[PDB]
């Protein structure tokens, strides 16, 4: 009853594959339990149309937790229990995590992908050729200076930065190319996490290897003395890069616990990037299934809104309804209380903290999809709660998803009202604006209509930006607003609804591999650090088996 | 075209059980490509071994050595007679292939396949030992920030951080820069991935639980007061062993004429011994009669290391041992420029013989019989050859002409490689000891194997010996850091150099595993991309490959 | 040319006379330049005072402003009627000669003389505070050397190295790199000489021992805790002390019309008062009867700091306060640029007064008189300047065409400063007090001096004050570091901008002073050369000079 204690019998992939409609040929085996399956599998089945997508979100997310992958996969679970043809896309976890803060597992409890230990460590490569197909851009940018710059690059305005997957801030601001004219040329730079580099944001929004191959030759790396742009194109990386990506562009076959199919496939911030793990893995699942579920970072403010304005936006997706997350602690956060006494009853509070659920539930509603509550079970939580949650609910199909406990049993409730709500109330998806609108027309529709604030403030920084953009082309690209998560303004202390409020950018970046990123406070955190308490210090496997994970 | 040579394997689950192998002990990495576990080592613990043969070469050189096809043309020539054989050789580095070109997986029909997988990402075991090596670091530096909790001096820290691709950039740099919140400032730089000491124990341990205790005793630096600091005074040992957990497993596959090869590891042959895995062989041993296997560099490092190093700590026993020589290597050896080797000539190659005629004799210096091999060549004439003949007058002497004539080249010598490692017997002894004093454990190795006449130490020499003696460290082997192009460290004095002197201007000291001793300016530990990179190249047709 | 205004100077040895000085209190630097000794006030200590006359000024303009050249021909007119009276002012950095060229001592026949020394090493004073400066960093860096004895964290080290040149180069730096014995690697910079501490210090002491004492109470950073270190805390002060054992006595000079000129000391207007050093105008006080000052940029900084900061501390008491204003300066501020400032125009000339007119406001609000003073103008025809005449119906108002007739121009406002410093008598009161709360301090100065409705205070902001004030640097004074050319931080709002508001990023603790509270990005603590450097057009002929 303990989660990384429950790592026990799941079917030979390739059986999974057969299954699903998958040849031999279509299959790369990795171990009994890991497949990468050709994008030709998708290529011979476009003309068959699409299942029923199903997005998971949740409300603002808070350090009271919430759960959102548990309930995306006991969902899964339960619409297979259910007799649907489903599968669950996700996204694949970072490495770092696992030593800083410890790993947690795909959701949890019987609600939970596997094999684990392989998911948040190498799992199938991707993240490493994400971090070399990266790295190398970085070394062949530097090299053209070493070689005399001929197409002219300020080093000082070097944008592209490096990139690993652990946490080091040591290596956040740094200096590089010393030690003489044999060492390259002197300046300053850094790294991020891995998951952050714009090289994981194509993999998750690429079409196939070679609308890969052509984003990543307009990633624009730094500029000349002019201004002028200086791309990766122009410094002819896309092929190497494309080359270093050739097997991460499949998607990762491996099923939950209950032998549901899953893929694992990307995974960006949702912050400096839509957040949704790759739309190949996505758009193969389909083709293959009847349902498909998935969900997408942070609140349904962020990930929501970037996986149909981003996502669905590039592959013609249109979302048949979505599932939110809440909790009844969460939830009475928002309405005021401490995390201290969250476990104490507070009908009020419940009720004042609602209106964070009851704000993504319209918002959910901008978009013209049909959404469904899924209030995740807890011990603590009475009835004289749950309830008023219920009743609370006066728009959307509520239930309760003892999912994380009962496996797909516990989902099974949420299944019945999906299927239900996927009956009667067909979607009519719009994404929330159109792309020729201006880019501070754009940043207020989000923050006007989604964030339900009064209007937006720049900072000079943030208008030059906003204009060497606009007027150099990358103008009527989609916007990505990096905030807080932890709230609908960019003060992480403003719980619950907050109103009469105003957005504040202050600096604003370029993704051309993408669109325009803009964050807000110092969302810039591109490289967390591993607390003052390693997990790794107590990491040990044995002569046998791990301990710690 | 040679990589046109992509053609005809065998699935290696297959092979894995054509030697004898659990399914369940195998893991897959596509139909071609496949991890064993220790498990069968372990599990035949007790059977019997086999015979080694050790197939090193000259004295490296721009005119083409030969120190890996040889080595397969040998196994593709020897089991070609019914024999129980495989190969275990080294993974090759992911950056060169993006800055140089990638070269044949030992060359000609030869070559081990899948090459692209082998040359890249291949079961990603490189990787493993990368975010090993960085997460020690990202430990050592993220410590700092908490309080310098043991009270090290940044200034001392010697533990560089990794990557696997070729730049000059990230050589010397400056971390930890931006204020109270982002951590403390101190210099640093990265090496090549291979390069690493998380590779050598790699390459050095017994098992996945050998592993983990070497590592705690590697050094990041000392405290304020001198006192050696090591990531098990961090507590990383775990973590690391953990992102290993599987690079600790062989990697098998095959040939184009399907001989079980094994690729697992690969570090330097001068800050480095050069060999592959110890526990990739170790198994190889049972799962067949014989193994053929190669060392780093000429003859002078990787062979007389491979002994000290690899054989020692394994208690292994080389039943014999080669070395190669092309036609055209030695006549450089006898003044014959590169753009001077297409013309016959015999007055060099018997002075550039000289070369090859000292390996020879250090060779059976360690106790192990021995076999010439030579590179068959289009110039290569009549005339030139038969002096070469001769000359080898003092043990085996052989033809492989595997490039190009599959195992059927290396046919004459595989015969005469068990012809000697049956009437000529071997008893195994390193050429030193690890009591002498770290000087005098140098100093027979410039001796006998190079052939100097003596080895003198800098100021800063003198020190760290004394300073590691008086920590204990001074009861280790020694890897001799020093060029290779010439038994000297003069990377000039070809062919064989006599009456010199090698001296030592400084010593690292690797915890996890030995003393390294650099002689002139082999820190080159990362490789430069040049201004025709072959990423400037390559490119990825809507289907496959074209450059690489 | 306004430098061959180079002509007959009377020796300092005489004038010193002729003003009363023991010959023995007076060091030479040539015949015309000279050092007066601190025994002269302590000497005269209780004898009586005199009329102080501050000369400020509008709020700046690219038009051209008279903040200096206005000071002197008071003089030159002042004086020129038999009267005891001197020049205080300020030494101008080195760097900015070879920037973008250096210019007249004042302005006109006023410029103070020798031009030449003035602008360059002069009497090496500002040297002394460099080497004072740059010696307590050397202390700093050697210190952590030793052991961090204190237990100081680098990174909290807010004390930068100096010098006097214009070079964006060494603003952001790091040093101390090179490893165990060349010191710890931490970030710093340097800032123009002038912009240092130990600058304000000078112009803020009471004598050569209240400096050692103030030194010791600068904060060069904190330890790992957040205590707080100082110079004291480094033993600093008595060495620092001594560098200064000299520059610590002003220096005497004269006017091309021979009037005693007092140029000692001299710092920023933002991060500092602005103010000349506050021992060569209490001496000047005695040695005569009058004392022309002047303070730094607009009347909305150096006027409210030289009150609150100079007066304050030394308790003096300013019977008087002049504000210059030419008639183009104005009309900016009525929207006129700077190439629409030939013709005549008077609709601007009246709200582009509002400017002047406010400072008028302020002037009075500290409890002194005040008068009107316009930079006479070729292009500033009758109508315009009749319009101006009336307009300052408040106070005093005259014309002082000095920068083109000598003295003679400043005749007529010299006779209205002693005919209002005679009638309309004065009672010195702080604008505030040390009390009330850091905010409470720059909220009184937003109000009514620059004309805001509020004060506004980052994330960033509010912590400092609170850390400081919480440690007790509470109870000091405030140095506004807010753009100036507008009564508010935007450099834009032009005239008298209304109903907007200051906002307070960030704020510095100035130990041996005050807080230093910035608005914008006044942190050009360091100028640049431009395209066209004046060093690369000077040149200094087999005799003298050319392009100075
Ligand atoms: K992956």
Redesign the interface.
Known sequence: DIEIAQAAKMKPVMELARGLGIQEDEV????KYKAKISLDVYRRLKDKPDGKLILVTAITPTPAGEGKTTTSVGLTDALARLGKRVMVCLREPS?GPS?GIKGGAAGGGYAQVVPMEDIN??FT?DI??V??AH??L???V??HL???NVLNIDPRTITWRRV????????????????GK????PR?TGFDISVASEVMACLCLASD??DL?ERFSRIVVGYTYDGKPVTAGD??????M???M??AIKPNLVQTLENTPAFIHGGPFANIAHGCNSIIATKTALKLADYVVTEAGFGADLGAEKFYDVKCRYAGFKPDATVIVATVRALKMHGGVPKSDLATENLEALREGFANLEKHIENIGKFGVPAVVAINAFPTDTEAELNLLYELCAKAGAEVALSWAKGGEGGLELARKVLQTLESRPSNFHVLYNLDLSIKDKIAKIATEIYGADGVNYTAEADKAIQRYESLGYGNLPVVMAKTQYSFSDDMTKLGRPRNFTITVREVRLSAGGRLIVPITGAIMTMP??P?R?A??????D?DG?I?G
């Open positions: 790369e085996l990795y171990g490495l030593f460590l190498h490569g490493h050729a971090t070399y790295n190398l970085a070394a062949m530097d090299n070493q070689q005399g690993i997957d652990l946490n080091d801030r040591a290596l956040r601001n740094i200096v590089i190319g010393l030690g044999a060492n390259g040329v300053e290897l070679m191959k410094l002819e990386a896309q092929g190497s494309a080359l270093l050739k097997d650090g591993l003052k390693p790794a210090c107590n990491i040990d496997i002569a791990v710690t």
